[PDB]
Amino acid sequence: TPDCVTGKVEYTKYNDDDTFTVKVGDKELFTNRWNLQSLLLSAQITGMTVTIKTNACHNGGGFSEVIFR
Amino acid sequence: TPDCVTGKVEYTKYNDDDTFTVKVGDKELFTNRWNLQSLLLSAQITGMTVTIKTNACHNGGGFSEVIFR
Amino acid sequence: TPDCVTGKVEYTKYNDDDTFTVKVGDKELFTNRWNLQSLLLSAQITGMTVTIKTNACHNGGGFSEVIFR
Amino acid sequence: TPDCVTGKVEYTKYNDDDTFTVKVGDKELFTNRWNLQSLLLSAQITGMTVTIKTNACHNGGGFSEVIFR
Amino acid sequence: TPDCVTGKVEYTKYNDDDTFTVKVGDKELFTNRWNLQSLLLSAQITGMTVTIKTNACHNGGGFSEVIFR
Amino acid sequence: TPDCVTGKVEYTKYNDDDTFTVKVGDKELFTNRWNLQSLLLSAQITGMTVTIKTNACHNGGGFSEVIFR
Amino acid sequence: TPDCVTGKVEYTKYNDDDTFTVKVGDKELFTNRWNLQSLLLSAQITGMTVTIKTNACHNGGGFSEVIFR
Amino acid sequence: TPDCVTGKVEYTKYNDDDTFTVKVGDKELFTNRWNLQSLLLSAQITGMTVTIKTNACHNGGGFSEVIFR
Amino acid sequence: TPDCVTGKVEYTKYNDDDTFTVKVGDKELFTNRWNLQSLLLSAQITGMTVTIKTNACHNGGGFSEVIFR
Amino acid sequence: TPDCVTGKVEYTKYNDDDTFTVKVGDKELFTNRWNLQSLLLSAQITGMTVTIKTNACHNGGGFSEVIFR
Ligand SMILES: CCNC(=O)OCCNC(=O)OCCO[C@H]1[C@H](O[C@H]2[C@H](O)[C@@H](O)[C@H](O)O[C@@H]2CO)O[C@H](CO)[C@H](O[C@H]2O[C@H](CO)[C@H](O)[C@H](O)[C@H]2O)[C@@H]1O
Ligand SMILES: CCNC(=O)OCCNC(=O)OCCO[C@H]1[C@H](O[C@H]2[C@H](O)[C@@H](O)[C@H](O)O[C@@H]2CO)O[C@H](CO)[C@H](O[C@H]2O[C@H](CO)[C@H](O)[C@H](O)[C@H]2O)[C@@H]1O
Ligand SMILES: CCNC(=O)OCCNC(=O)OCCO[C@H]1[C@H](O[C@H]2[C@H](O)[C@@H](O)[C@H](O)O[C@@H]2CO)O[C@H](CO)[C@H](O[C@H]2O[C@H](CO)[C@H](O)[C@H](O)[C@H]2O)[C@@H]1O
Ligand SMILES: CCNC(=O)OCCNC(=O)OCCO[C@H]1[C@H](O[C@H]2[C@H](O)[C@@H](O)[C@H](O)O[C@@H]2CO)O[C@H](CO)[C@H](O[C@H]2O[C@H](CO)[C@H](O)[C@H](O)[C@H]2O)[C@@H]1O
Ligand SMILES: CCNC(=O)OCCNC(=O)OCCO[C@H]1[C@H](O[C@H]2[C@H](O)[C@@H](O)[C@H](O)O[C@@H]2CO)O[C@H](CO)[C@H](O[C@H]2O[C@H](CO)[C@H](O)[C@H](O)[C@H]2O)[C@@H]1O
Ligand SMILES: CCNC(=O)OCCNC(=O)OCCO[C@H]1[C@H](O[C@H]2[C@H](O)[C@@H](O)[C@H](O)O[C@@H]2CO)O[C@H](CO)[C@H](O[C@H]2O[C@H](CO)[C@H](O)[C@H](O)[C@H]2O)[C@@H]1O
Ligand SMILES: CCNC(=O)OCCNC(=O)OCCO[C@H]1[C@H](O[C@H]2[C@H](O)[C@@H](O)[C@H](O)O[C@@H]2CO)O[C@H](CO)[C@H](O[C@H]2O[C@H](CO)[C@H](O)[C@H](O)[C@H]2O)[C@@H]1O
Ligand SMILES: CCNC(=O)OCCNC(=O)OCCO[C@H]1[C@H](O[C@H]2[C@H](O)[C@@H](O)[C@H](O)O[C@@H]2CO)O[C@H](CO)[C@H](O[C@H]2O[C@H](CO)[C@H](O)[C@H](O)[C@H]2O)[C@@H]1O
Ligand SMILES: CCNC(=O)OCCNC(=O)OCCO[C@H]1[C@H](O[C@H]2[C@H](O)[C@@H](O)[C@H](O)O[C@@H]2CO)O[C@H](CO)[C@H](O[C@H]2O[C@H](CO)[C@H](O)[C@H](O)[C@H]2O)[C@@H]1O
Ligand SMILES: CCNC(=O)OCCNC(=O)OCCO[C@H]1[C@H](O[C@H]2[C@H](O)[C@@H](O)[C@H](O)O[C@@H]2CO)O[C@H](CO)[C@H](O[C@H]2O[C@H](CO)[C@H](O)[C@H](O)[C@H]2O)[C@@H]1O
């Protein structure tokens, strides 16, 4: 899967349908994987650099693959 | 969903029915989403600014949408 | 539910029946709510002030309501 | 010295003259005590509730007394 | 249940059968309680003093009771 | 020097004369040692148990000796 | 099970099939144990030294045993 | 003083002349204020959003004013 | 300088003469280096393993060399 | 100044002459800058990746320039 955006987490959002949205770089993306909710908030809280990989690389696109550095 | 309150978490409360209450700004609101319990306590512990979005924007009103900054 | 004790968590204990015991102020109380186990240890670790509300306000009494400040 | 404001630290600012500004509640106040710079940032980072005591309780007023809870 | 060992967590280990091993003092003990896995790692990470209570107080013995201080 | 109070830090206060006040157990004590200011706030933030040793064991009394556990 | 690699976690990755990949030393390894996802991210965040034990000690190999120091 | 850049700290650098460099947004700026060295590293470590204010808003420019949010 | 003790910090103590005492393993040792006071408390708070090197390897002996792992 | 080593901090050491030694990658290097002592321990504690720049790129060599990521 190709890299979409790399950077620090600007903000995260819990959605009404239980999905989770994250804003990294200039993209707002969402994921339906429940395990990723606490992992991404932890990366936000500790200033980690994350790389999100997805073919739906556009605002509102979904993802499941993330690299935490 | 419209913004209701934005601010730091003043306190949180675990309820007898397993719901979770949060006090942000001048509103006390609750949520029945289990995943949000640890996320909101983490935001409280790290001084994050949260925005709660809900149509029931009054004391005792419920919510499911939160932005963590 | 009336306030029972307010203070910092002195210690916590995982029990053989999977319940969790907490010592706050001069009372040792237990809870059978699984979600509260990590929330109370987090409050212990970060020096939070907690208020436990219960009608069984005596050593060995149970509770489910807690306010985290 | 009378209480001026109580609340969580909204933001802090390092000034050109080496003083430190803090925004708590609806007041922006500054202090010239060097030691308080790291203590206030730590309170900001850990979501502590602080009470600033000063007779110059107005925007731009200075202070030296702070209670950390 | 009698005290077995008291001290800081030296190391922890995730086992192939999903049990968790902990080394406290001069004993290596394991537990099959899933909830204790994150609680013990948190105690390890924050330098907490733990007391493990078990009748199988020998290397390889199991436990379920732990006091976190 | 005899033990005065043992417990968790309830609150700390920076004073106008640059001394630091701490409330542990039922005593409010102060210290004029600059180094202790960040050490005591760190103990407050991490829920450490501290023992303050002083012959002036009364409200307003001073101290310089502290054990961090 | 023999030791494969010992060192600090260089990065972690959540995969599309819900497995988790970790880079320690010169090896990229994955695990299908859900519990290990938050434990390994916590070790990454706190600079812990980990030892991964596996017979598939090569890039892409899987593991279930980890020692956290 | 006008805002120059707002964002998360991408990296920091200790220089041979004892000044400190920070990369925020698309600018690499330095400061000669010793107190700011630990404050900026703490903001980096906790993922804070900072605004640097300076008239020398270009790579290599210096600053002394920072807002920590 | 030969190794004296290796282990986790059991407790630390600020002394009346401004020296700092640490208990590691079965030895209580002190140091007069001011910089080491916050470094050792940080190692205590984060459960680090420290090795103290000193020729005065006995209770009450002094040291200046410490390895933090 | 050319890069010497990049990696996570393996261990740090306080020396008898008040200098500070750090082991990154395959090199043990020291610095005489007092400010860097707490900054490097913080990077060790939070698993940061550091790049040390120095012309004395060999065991025992000194440095003053470090990039914290
Ligand atoms: C676990 C089962 N998944 C599930 O139910 O997902 C439904 C939600 N997905 C969704 O709305 O899918 C819409 C298309 O977008 C996903 C995109 O799909 C690609 C596909 O892989 C390519 O083969 C195709 O050529 O193009 C489409 C459109 O771009 O794949 C992305 C990953 O690269 C995202 O999928 C991933 O993230 C979602 C949301 O979290 C699910 O988890 C997917 O399973 C995961 O693969 C886009 O959503
Ligand atoms: C999926 C599980 N939902 C469920 O069982 O929720 C029952 C709890 N709901 C509740 O008490 O509902 C009372 C009405 O309040 C919710 C409010 O509803 C709006 C509605 O969306 C509008 O269309 C309508 O015009 O007005 C009503 C009243 O204002 O919507 C809020 C969000 O905007 C809250 O709902 C949200 O939060 C609750 C509690 O956490 C549930 O999670 C809902 O699913 C979530 O949408 C008010 O509770
Ligand atoms: C929802 C599942 N509950 C369940 O299985 O609870 C079993 C463990 N409960 C138990 O031992 O209860 C014994 C009585 O003690 C509880 C006490 O009950 C009060 C009651 O509310 C009053 O109306 C009555 O006049 O007096 C009794 C006895 O004092 O209520 C307490 C709260 O105020 C505690 O209950 C709470 O905590 C337990 C354990 O965590 C359960 O979670 C309860 O559901 C919760 O309400 C006392 O245990
Ligand atoms: C360490 C010596 N202090 C010094 O150099 O302070 C100079 C900066 N002070 C300043 O600008 O003072 C201007 C007046 O404002 C201070 C205010 O003063 C009150 C005074 O308390 C009353 O008794 C008087 O009736 O009215 C004046 C005017 O309001 O006192 C405040 C505290 O209550 C503030 O002082 C405190 O904070 C400053 C800045 O950090 C200094 O640290 C002072 O020493 C400290 O007392 C107002 O600044
Ligand atoms: C949840 C149900 N438990 C279960 O499936 O446990 C199986 C794993 N247990 C195990 O291997 O038990 C073997 C015996 O060792 C346990 C020991 O048992 C004592 C017993 O308490 C005495 O009364 C008896 O006289 O002697 C036996 C033999 O020593 O008890 C220990 C506690 O004191 C340990 O049990 C505890 O820990 C295990 C593993 O985590 C289980 O959780 C047990 O439920 C828990 O009680 C020894 O394992
Ligand atoms: C090294 C600089 N010391 C200095 O300037 O101290 C001035 C502030 N001290 C002060 O107000 O002292 C008043 C008396 O109180 C101290 C108390 O003194 C005992 C004394 O040790 C006994 O021998 C005597 O019998 O009784 C008196 C009064 O009870 O000693 C306390 C410790 O046991 C406190 O002193 C300590 O704390 C202060 C303030 O932080 C200084 O740091 C002292 O140096 C330190 O020893 C009481 O303040
Ligand atoms: C929980 C049940 N496990 C399961 O469903 O695992 C499927 C994932 N396994 C996998 O792909 O297995 C492929 C072979 O690699 C594993 C390796 O297996 C060795 C085996 O131990 C030797 O006895 C044999 O001679 O050679 C094979 C080939 O290498 O064993 C490793 C551990 O030493 C790894 O297994 C472990 O990790 C995986 C992934 O997390 C599973 O959890 C296994 O259960 C666990 O044992 C290699 O994956
Ligand atoms: C504490 C005394 N300061 C001192 O010794 O600083 C020497 C380092 N200064 C430096 O190299 O100055 C070069 C010019 O750049 C500073 C810039 O200056 C502007 C000035 O504000 C305008 O009025 C003028 O028209 O143009 C000049 C040229 O740009 O001002 C910046 C702030 O807006 C920076 O200064 C600040 O940061 C430096 C380095 O940390 C010092 O701390 C300054 O005191 C501080 O004001 C540019 O460095
Ligand atoms: C630079 C400031 N030094 C100073 O003022 O130190 C006075 C405190 N020293 C002290 O009490 O010395 C008592 C003897 O104990 C130190 C011990 O000394 C060795 C010596 O190095 C050997 O050459 C000799 O053969 O035996 C003596 C006795 O064992 O050395 C120890 C380290 O190996 C300790 O010294 C270190 O720690 C102290 C206290 O922190 C000072 O920092 C010393 O500078 C430091 O070297 C014993 O205290
Ligand atoms: C602040 C004053 N510095 C001071 O007193 O430093 C004395 C300790 N330095 C030392 O032992 O120097 C020995 C040579 O090693 C340093 C090395 O020097 C280079 C030099 O820059 C080149 O121009 C020359 O061609 O080769 C020599 C040898 O390689 O420079 C290094 C930086 O690249 C190190 O210096 C840096 O670190 C030390 C220790 O912390 C001091 O802080 C230096 O000031 C700092 O520049 C080597 O130590």
Out of C16, C18, C38, the one facing E39 most closely (by C-beta) is C38
Query: Which of these, I64, I24, I28, lies nearest to I48 by C-alpha position?
Result: I24
Q: Which residue from C28, J8, C11, C50 is spatially nearest to E43, judged by alpha carbons?
A: C11
Spatial distance between the Cα atoms of B55 and A16, rounded to a whole number of angstroms: 12
Ligand 2 pocket by Cβ (under 6 Å): A 16; B 1, 31-33, 54-56, 62-64
Domains in chain G, please, with CATH?
Answer: 1-69 (2.40.50.70)
C-alpha J31/C-alpha J36 separation (Å) is: 8
* Cβ contact A14–B33 (<8 Å): yes
Interatomic CA distance for residues J28 and E30, integer angstroms? 37
A and B: touch, per 3+ CB pairs < 8 A? yes
Please check whether residue E51 is in contact with residue E66, taking contact to mean a CB–CB distance below 8 angstroms: yes
Phi, psi of G16 (to 5 degrees): -60, -25
Q: How far apart are CA I3 and CA J65, in angstroms?
A: 30
Q: How was this structure determined?
A: X-ray
Residues of H in contact with A10 (CB under 8 A): 8
Spatial distance between the Cα atoms of B22 and C39, rounded to a whole number of angstroms: 14
Of the ligands numbered here, which is closest to the C-alpha atom of H52? 8
Q: Which residues line ligand 7 at a C-beta cut-off of 6 Å?
A: E 16; G 1, 31-33, 54-56, 61-64
Number of the ligand closest to the Cα of J15: 9
F23 forms beta bridges with F11, F28
Distance in angstroms (rounded) separating the CA atoms of residues E30 and E60: 7
- Residue J51 has φ and ψ, to the nearest 5°, of -120, 120
Chain centre distance of CA E19: 11
Question: Which residues from chain G sit within 8 angstroms of residue J46, using beta carbons?
Answer: 45-47
Q: Which residue has the tokens 């990229």?
A: G28
Reported structure resolution in angstroms: 2.2
Instruction: Tell me which residues of chain D, numbers 16 to 35, contact chain H at a CB-CB cutoff of 8 Å.
Output: 16, 18, 34
User: J67 — contact with chain H (CB < 8 Å)?
Assistant: yes
Question: H/E element holding B29?
Answer: strand B27-31
Q: Check: CB of residue G58 under 8 Å from CB of residue J56.
A: no
Distance CA I30, CA F19 (A): 25
Is I40 an 8 Å CB contact of chain E? no
Contact predicate B39/B48, CB 8 Å = no
DSSP-derived letter for residue H6 is E
- Which residues 6+ apart lie within 8 Å of A38 measured at CB? B38, B39, G38
**Nearest CB to E65 within list C11, C14, C34:** C14
Q: In this structure, are residues G25 and J63 in contact, taking their beta carbons and an 8 Å threshold?
A: no
Q: How far is CA C1 from CA B23, C36, C62, D62, G59, in A?
A: 18, 18, 13, 43, 57
Give the gyration radius of chain A's Cα atoms: 11
Q: Is C46 on the interface with D (CB under 8 A)?
A: yes
CA D7 to chain centre: 10
When computed from its CA atoms, the radius of gyration of chain E, rounded to whole angstroms, is 11
- Residue A7: CB partners within 8 Å, gap ≥ 6? A24, A25, A49, A50
| Ligand 3 nearest atom to the CA of residue C55, by list position | 33
Q: Where are the beta strands (DSSP E) in F1-69?
A: 3-14, 20-24, 27-31, 49-53, 65-68
Within 10 angstroms of residue F21's Cβ, the number of other Cβ atoms is 18
Residue of A nearest to H43 (CA): A47
Judged on CB neighbours under 10 Å (0-12, 13-18, 19+), I41 is: buried
Nearest-by-Cβ selection for I44 from E9, E45, E47? E47
DSSP code string of F3-20: EEEEEEEEEEEE-TTS-E
